[PDB]
Amino acid sequence: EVARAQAALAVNISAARGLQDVLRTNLGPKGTMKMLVSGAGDIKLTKDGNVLLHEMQIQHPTASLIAKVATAQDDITGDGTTSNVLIIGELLKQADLYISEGLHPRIITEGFEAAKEKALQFLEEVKVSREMDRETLIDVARTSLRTKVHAELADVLTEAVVDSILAIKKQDEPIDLFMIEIMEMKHKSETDTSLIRGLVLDHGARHPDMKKRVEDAYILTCNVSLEYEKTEVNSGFFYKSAEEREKLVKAERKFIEDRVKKIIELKRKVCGDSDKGFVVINQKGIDPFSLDALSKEGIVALRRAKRRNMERLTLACGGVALNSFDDLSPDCLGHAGLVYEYTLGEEKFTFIEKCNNPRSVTLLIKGPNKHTLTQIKDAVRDGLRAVKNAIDDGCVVPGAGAVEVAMAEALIKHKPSVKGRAQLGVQAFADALLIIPKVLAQNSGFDLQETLVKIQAEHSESGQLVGVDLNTGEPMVAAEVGVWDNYCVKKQLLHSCTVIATNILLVDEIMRAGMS
Amino acid sequence: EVARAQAALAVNISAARGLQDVLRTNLGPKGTMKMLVSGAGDIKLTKDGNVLLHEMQIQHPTASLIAKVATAQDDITGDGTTSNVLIIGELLKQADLYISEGLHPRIITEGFEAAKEKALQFLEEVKVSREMDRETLIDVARTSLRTKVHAELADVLTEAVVDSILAIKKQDEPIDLFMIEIMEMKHKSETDTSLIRGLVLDHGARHPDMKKRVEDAYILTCNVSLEYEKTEVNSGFFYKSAEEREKLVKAERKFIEDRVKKIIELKRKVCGDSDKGFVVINQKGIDPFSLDALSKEGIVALRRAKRRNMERLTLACGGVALNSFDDLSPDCLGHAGLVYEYTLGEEKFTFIEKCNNPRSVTLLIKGPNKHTLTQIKDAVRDGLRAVKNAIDDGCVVPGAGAVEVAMAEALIKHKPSVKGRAQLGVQAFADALLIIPKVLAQNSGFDLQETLVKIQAEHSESGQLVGVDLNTGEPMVAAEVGVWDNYCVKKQLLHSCTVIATNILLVDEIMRAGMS
Amino acid sequence: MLKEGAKHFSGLEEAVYRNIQACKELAQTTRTAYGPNGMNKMVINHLEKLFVTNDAATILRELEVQHPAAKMIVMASHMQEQEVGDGTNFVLVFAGALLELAEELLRIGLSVSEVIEGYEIACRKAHEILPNLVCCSAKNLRDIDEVSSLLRTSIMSKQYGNEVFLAKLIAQACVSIFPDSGHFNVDNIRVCKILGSGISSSSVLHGMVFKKETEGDVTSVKDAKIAVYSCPFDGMITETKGTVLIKTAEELMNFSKGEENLMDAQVKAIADTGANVVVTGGKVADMALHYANKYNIMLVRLNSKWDLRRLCKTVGATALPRLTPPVLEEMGHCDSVYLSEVGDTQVVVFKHEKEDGAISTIVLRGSTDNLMDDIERAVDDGVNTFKVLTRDKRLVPGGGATEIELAKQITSYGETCPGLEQYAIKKFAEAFEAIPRALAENSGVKANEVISKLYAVHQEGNKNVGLDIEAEVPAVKDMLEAGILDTYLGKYWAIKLATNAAVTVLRVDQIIMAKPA
Numbered sequence A, B: 001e002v003a004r005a006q007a008a009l010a011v012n013i014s015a016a017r018g019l020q021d022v023l024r025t026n027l028g029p030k031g032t033m034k035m036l037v038s039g040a041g042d043i044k045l046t047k048d049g050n051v052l053l054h055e056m057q058i059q060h061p062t063a064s065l066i067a068k069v070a071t072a073q074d075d076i077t078g079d080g081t082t083s084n085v086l087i088i089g090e091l092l093k094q095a096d097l098y099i100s101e102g103l104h105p106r107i108i109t110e111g112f113e114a115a116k117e118k119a120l121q122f123l124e125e126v127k128v129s130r131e132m133d134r135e136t137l138i139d140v141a142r143t144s145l146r147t148k149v150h151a152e153l154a155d156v157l158t159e160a161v162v163d164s165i166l167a168i169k170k171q172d173e174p175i176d177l178f179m180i181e182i183m184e185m186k187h188k189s190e191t192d193t194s195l196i197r198g199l200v201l202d203h204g205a206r207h208p209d210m211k212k213r214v215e216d217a218y219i220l221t222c223n224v225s226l227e228y229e230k231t232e233v234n235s236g237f238f239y240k241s242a243e244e245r246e247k248l249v250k251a252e253r254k255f256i257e258d259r260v261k262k263i264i265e266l267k268r269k270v271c272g273d274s275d276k277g278f279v280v281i282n283q284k285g286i287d288p289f290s291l292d293a294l295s296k297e298g299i300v301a302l303r304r305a306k307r308r309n310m311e312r313l314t315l316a317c318g319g320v321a322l323n324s325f326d327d328l329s330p331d332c333l334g335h336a337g338l339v340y341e342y343t344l345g346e347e348k349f350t351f352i353e354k355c356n357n358p359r360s361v362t363l364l365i366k367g368p369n370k371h372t373l374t375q376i377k378d379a380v381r382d383g384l385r386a387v388k389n390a391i392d393d394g395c396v397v398p399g400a401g402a403v404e405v406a407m408a409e410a411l412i413k414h415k416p417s418v419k420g421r422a423q424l425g426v427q428a429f430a431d432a433l434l435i436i437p438k439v440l441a442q443n444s445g446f447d448l449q450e451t452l453v454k455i456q457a458e459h460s461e462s463g464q465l466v467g468v469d470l471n472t473g474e475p476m477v478a479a480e481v482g483v484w485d486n487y488c489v490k491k492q493l494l495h496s497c498t499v500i501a502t503n504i505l506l507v508d509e510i511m512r513a514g515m516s
Numbered sequence C: 001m002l003k004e005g006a007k008h009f010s011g012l013e014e015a016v017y018r019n020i021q022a023c024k025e026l027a028q029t030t031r032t033a034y035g036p037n038g039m040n041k042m043v044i045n046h047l048e049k050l051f052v053t054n055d056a057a058t059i060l061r062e063l064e065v066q067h068p069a070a071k072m073i074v075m076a077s078h079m080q081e082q083e084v085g086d087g088t089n090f091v092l093v094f095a096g097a098l099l100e101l102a103e104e105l106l107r108i109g110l111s112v113s114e115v116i117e118g119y120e121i122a123c124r125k126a127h128e129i130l131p132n133l134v135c136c137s138a139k140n141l142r143d144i145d146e147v148s149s150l151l152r153t154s155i156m157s158k159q160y161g162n163e164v165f166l167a168k169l170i171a172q173a174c175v176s177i178f179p180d181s182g183h184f185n186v187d188n189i190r191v192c193k194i195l196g197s198g199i200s201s202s203s204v205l206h207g208m209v210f211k212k213e214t215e216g217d218v219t220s221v222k223d224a225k226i227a228v229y230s231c232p233f234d235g236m237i238t239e240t241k242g243t244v245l246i247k248t249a250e251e252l253m254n255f256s257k258g259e260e261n262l263m264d265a266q267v268k269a270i271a272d273t274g275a276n277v278v279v280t281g282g283k284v285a286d287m288a289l290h291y292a293n294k295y296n297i298m299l300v301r302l303n304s305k306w307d308l309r310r311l312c313k314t315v316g317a318t319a320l321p322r323l324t325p326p327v328l329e330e331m332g333h334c335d336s337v338y339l340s341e342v343g344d345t346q347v348v349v350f351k352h353e354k355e356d357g358a359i360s361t362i363v364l365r366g367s368t369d370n371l372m373d374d375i376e377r378a379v380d381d382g383v384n385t386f387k388v389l390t391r392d393k394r395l396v397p398g399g400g401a402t403e404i405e406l407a408k409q410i411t412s413y414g415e416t417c418p419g420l421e422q423y424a425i426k427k428f429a430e431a432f433e434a435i436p437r438a439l440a441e442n443s444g445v446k447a448n449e450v451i452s453k454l455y456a457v458h459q460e461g462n463k464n465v466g467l468d469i470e471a472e473v474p475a476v477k478d479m480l481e482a483g484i485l486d487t488y489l490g491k492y493w494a495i496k497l498a499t500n501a502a503v504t505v506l507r508v509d510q511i512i513m514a515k516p517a
Ligand SMILES: Nc1ncnc2c1ncn2[C@@H]1O[C@H](COP(=O)(O)OP(=O)(O)O)[C@@H](O)[C@H]1O
Pocket: A026, A027, A028, A029, A079, A082, A083, A143, A144, A146, A147, A148, A399, A400, A401, A436, A468, A470, A483
């Protein structure tokens, strides 16, 4: 009820340190994966930051709120939820130490804001442009795949991603990630990828072995009742007399015969040979006695079609979906260039390509029938997101821990003003930016201070952006190897860290109340 | 029995921090006094560092050993036991923090040694000489009294100290603090001091009121049995016959009569008037019937004399102590120029001055009959020690917290070498030297960081030795006010601090064994 | 504390402890087998019959583990079982040895990335040097003894007493269909159980074999179309009781006459539609057998779910358990159905082979039902081992003579490249000494002297410890002229799966949390 002390800040710092120590071994390509299982024994492997933070059982409410706030700011850029809690924890520890020494949170907040402004100015002045081509996107996708998946199958996916990006992007407006469908199958091998330039149909026909070399084909989408079921029906209500239902069944059969005769005469009128083929898509069943008579003249009819399939077919080609099989204008009939039938498993697939306006690429992937296929899909999605983020702008700054060192050197040496109160916060903000290279050197398997002072001496003697090597621990330049990054991601991360560290030190007392 | 952890360093750092926090409020003239009482309710008031550390009950063995080591290094210079545990505690805390971060004690020790060498070189290069006169010693004694006694009677004490120093020191060899006797009395007032240029005799005569204006006086020291007791004695063994003891008493009386006749004829031969007086010092009693006959001619004899009194008399004047009252050469008779009798209390004192070679000054002090007289004596002894230390050398550097700032600025900026491992210790050694001005500003009644950054900005703008003001908290120059210090004291303090901080981090494990 | 809820003991210290101890405890209950020895273990689950088994497949299929480290190996075991025929305990032993040898490297002070890289390099070197110890090869598969020797060698791992007659029977059953060249199926050989004499009176027979009696007539025509049904002789007319003693005879006689007329019309409609025989799966009746005998219709008696399931999955018909007489919609391809008398029992024989996709069914007979399981297991193991899909099997001298050579080659190769990658290579080389040790410890003597003798003779690669008493201490025998060889692709697949499992185990090793509700 009554509490006038400083235990709230203490428990907040403790929770922040605990959350920072819990998640800190998932940075860099040489990290350790994690597993989650609880519901009916479902083994799920993960290593991402947002996926882990969204599916966990945290017993601390402050840590849960911090994770929720961090995940709420992940829909802005690509992937920026990781490598954020460490700097926040370091800043909070420095603020707690300065409070225990004797200071006010207002001066600390002012110094943090000044340091953030100085870092933003330094990042804006240090940026550089580069001509976007094929090698840059290839290197970006390779780095993304290395940071996501292991260094094995990271070579056959980047090429397909670059090819799909080059085939989709061809205009000047920003591209959209809604025309690329990522499907999955079940095979025995592991490394198996395919880049289809057309559409994919899961279902086919019940009577195969007739023809498959149909060039210029005409596709018509409808939704009429061709053959739903042979069972007698009426109007959704059972009756007692059989004469009425048998007459209704006879009338339905006569209507089906009239419809198949109409479509036969339509195919005979619009064609008349074997080169001009016709394909019909219907969600209802197809009788074999009528399917044989249809295939005798040269027109294929498919059964059991999904809604998304016909939606993509009418969106890529451009056809009107009517509820009649009458003789109308052939303007709604879509054109198809090449049709192929792939026989594998218990259902044959259909691949249609060489159509008008190829704006539909399919990235077919296969797995060894487990849960790693979802991980591969998430990795390729993160890679596509990184490629899209690296194509909207024209400035790419190097990474590999070569930006925080220069930022700290500019914040410590070239001070913007002369003030001890502001310096007390500037030093704390600059000392919290060197946690990334230390953590990288610790996870790589080397020392922490030796490599740090080596990089410091290399940057003080030379003056270029010195990176961190994960092989021999020697200071090298990341501007000539191939390690790159983004632009707005660092700004968003800095803004999020400043917002989180600002609205934390102003906590006075925590009372126990509330009912809702 | 078996232990392999790092709890020893942890408990050592904890004990060091506790010992630093226990004694830290006794720095500067505006310090708080303490009290000690345990033995039969004896109230004792003190404020010194060694006196407190020597009479305390510590429950920790490590703290007791540290206090013993600190007290064993106070017999070199004057007073350097204070303002030492703070820097050691700060260095130990920095070393513990660097160990918890991840480092080796060898690099820390090497960096500490390098920083100590750099500080020694800076102190040797920054020293300056000054002509020793009267105002410098006056200011030094005034500061030494202000750092111990209150700012009320810090005038007649330093004036008398300077007068005694000028009267004693007149040769070229270093002076000795063994010819100055500090006596004490019992009066009603508080501020009562006197500087006697002669000797002091506690006892006098049993029959006063005869004469006191004795100019040229001859003093002779002996130890014969003039009148020990009227009781019959023999040879330390009681007998049965009374004739033998009465004959021995008669023979002793005849010998006493012969001795007094001999000294009477000696006084009549060597004098014969009333100007040349004859004073006799004897530790035995004096009969009044013989004392009257002695005073009838003009010779005074004192009874009940201490050994130190006759020792000082024969050391200042120069007389042979014989065991006979025969007519011998007057070469052993010391000369006295002025004799005075002071009547106060229950015993009259004798003051002899105007003698040959005045090398005996007495600093008489009176108190209000309590325990503060011992404190005043300790304060005047510390002042005399500081004056003696300030007279052996010829170089005096300013103080008031103006040497540590320049040392830290030289250790941080102008680095002797370029090495991260050495800098890791140099920064820790430089950050621990700022514990004096911060504590001084905290004890004065002001802030801790505001005054620090103000002094830093003043030293960066101007460049002179800026001190700390204990009145308004504004940065001022200590080279024009009157605040001074020593030379070898700082070197001894730095050596002791380095020795203590070096042989502490090398502690491995502490086992429980031993029998002696 | 912050993530878990006092359920699992995971953290930053259980990696070099529990993740290895779980696998060690899982593998300790498996080293007792592996070799021609009599170490039967009883299995008690839900059948409540108390049966003893020897293979580890049925042992692992009944044990329920609650650990991810133990569940990460059963997947690889099932994958290896689905891939080739045998091969199960080898992967587990290799993974256990690799984990036990990597525990020391992790306790010394080395990262897991270097160990993983060294293990991958050693696996690549072993896979590259593997195609080099090819001695014997398959000549012609049209003979008898050429495959009989391999069948005997494969059966000797399971049963040690009787292994010649079973191998000869399997060879005769496999050579009567199609060889490995061209196309050969596996689900075309059935095993039937006959409760009669012992195993010393078995025979072979081509075609379908079913123990079903016949109470009608011998129908040896080709127009006898089959007609499978669920329970046609169940109860189309349900009769109740009116009083306590008996009711009027008129109503009972009328109901009986009506039921007889109904069943007569039913059998007439089912016989005139084009189906001379009918497959029943219910009870029998006096009038039923009377009509079946007077109408020349074969009537069965024994019913089983497996029989109808096989008839449905082979022919392609569908049972119609209806009351009203339906139409003929179960037309198949069978036509030649004959009856035979075997062991005083009536059996059926189907003839429909056109020199393509032939089937066979070996006749098995034993004392009780708890002894034919091991025989069927040995038969199916030999059948799976016979399939290799290659003309030249390229057999290698198995039993442990190649493991020592591979270990020596890896050791000689590792003492060349400098760096911190020699420890993992040495560990991978030393882990190969787990097959002769388990074979020597499961016999009666020690294993150190056997290893010393195997390493002291020569590096020929054709020496291995025998099974008799005169081959335990010396262990100097030539298995090339005896006829003890192993599969080349099987060992390769086993090594690959073991390396993959070890990599997966060493990779995923940090903190095991839980999922929110
Ligand atoms: N090829 C590389 N070489 C060295 N360091 C890299 C490389 N790729 C990424 N990093 C490091 O990984 C860090 C970010 O990794 P992570 O948190 O997994 O996010 P992402 O997956 O977007 O890289 C960066 O600080 C960067 O220094």
